[PDB]
Design an enzyme around this catalytic site. Sequence first.
Site, PDB file in Angstrom:
ATOM      1  N   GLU A 105       0.825  -1.201   0.000  1.00 51.40           N
ATOM      2  CA  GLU A 105       0.000   0.000   0.000  1.00 51.40           C
ATOM      3  C   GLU A 105       0.862   1.254   0.000  1.00 51.40           C
ATOM      4  OE1 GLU A 105      -3.109   0.494  -0.409  1.00 51.40           O
ATOM      5  OE2 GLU A 105      -4.135  -1.395   0.015  1.00 51.40           O
TER       6      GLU A 105
ATOM      7  N   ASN B 120      -7.207   8.630  -5.711  1.00 50.19           N
ATOM      8  CA  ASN B 120      -8.013   7.646  -6.424  1.00 50.19           C
ATOM      9  C   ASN B 120      -8.770   8.290  -7.579  1.00 50.19           C
ATOM     10  OD1 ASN B 120      -8.584   6.559  -3.142  1.00 50.19           O
ATOM     11  ND2 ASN B 120      -7.354   5.402  -4.617  1.00 50.19           N
TER      12      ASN B 120
ATOM     13  N   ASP C  12     -11.933   8.322  -8.138  1.00 44.15           N
ATOM     14  CA  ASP C  12     -13.222   8.884  -7.747  1.00 44.15           C
ATOM     15  C   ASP C  12     -13.090  10.236  -7.041  1.00 44.15           C
ATOM     16  OD1 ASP C  12     -12.039   7.939  -5.467  1.00 44.15           O
ATOM     17  OD2 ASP C  12     -13.802   6.876  -4.706  1.00 44.15           O
TER      18      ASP C  12
ATOM     19  N   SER D 172     -11.250  10.867  -4.320  1.00 43.39           N
ATOM     20  CA  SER D 172     -10.744  10.681  -2.964  1.00 43.39           C
ATOM     21  C   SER D 172      -9.234  10.462  -2.981  1.00 43.39           C
ATOM     22  CB  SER D 172     -11.438   9.500  -2.283  1.00 43.39           C
ATOM     23  OG  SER D 172     -11.085   8.271  -2.896  1.00 43.39           O
TER      24      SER D 172
ATOM     25  N   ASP E  28      -6.005   8.143  -0.811  1.00 42.80           N
ATOM     26  CA  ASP E  28      -5.576   7.210   0.220  1.00 42.80           C
ATOM     27  C   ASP E  28      -4.420   7.809   1.014  1.00 42.80           C
ATOM     28  OD1 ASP E  28      -7.491   5.436  -0.699  1.00 42.80           O
ATOM     29  OD2 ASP E  28      -6.098   4.424  -2.062  1.00 42.80           O
TER      30      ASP E  28
ATOM     31  N   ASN F   8      -8.705   5.553   2.907  1.00 43.91           N
ATOM     32  CA  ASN F   8      -9.445   6.427   2.001  1.00 43.91           C
ATOM     33  C   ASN F   8     -10.102   7.623   2.695  1.00 43.91           C
ATOM     34  OD1 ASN F   8     -11.745   6.941  -0.300  1.00 43.91           O
ATOM     35  ND2 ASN F   8      -9.992   5.781  -1.087  1.00 43.91           N
TER      36      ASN F   8
END
Length: 129
Positions: free
Chosen positions: A35, A46, A48, A50, A52, A59
């Site tokens: 990650e 991301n 969309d 958002s 991380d 998120n």
Amino acid sequence: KVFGRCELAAAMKRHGLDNYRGYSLGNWVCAAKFESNFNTQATNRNTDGSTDYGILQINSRWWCNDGRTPGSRNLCNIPCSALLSSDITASVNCAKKIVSDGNGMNAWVAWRNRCKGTDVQAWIRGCRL
């Protein structure tokens, strides 16, 4: 902060991630490796809108607030910047909420794709734990 492998393992174990929701300490270190590459300051946007955040790439649509994510719920009730601290306490506390949402560690796309089913114990090899 870029964590050492055994360094993060000891940090995660202490904060009670070892076998939290039945997930061995190896799964969490493995997740954090793919990650964030053990980097606490890791940020990834991301598709969309958002982002991380942190050692476990948490998120900003559901778990933390970064002020730039429409429909932000901030269920862990923290600023997303707090997930980037060298102290992983905030990340662990929120990760416990995430892994308890129902879908376990499958919430982490990297875990399901790179850790799930694999020899995750190999991640705590050599670690004086």
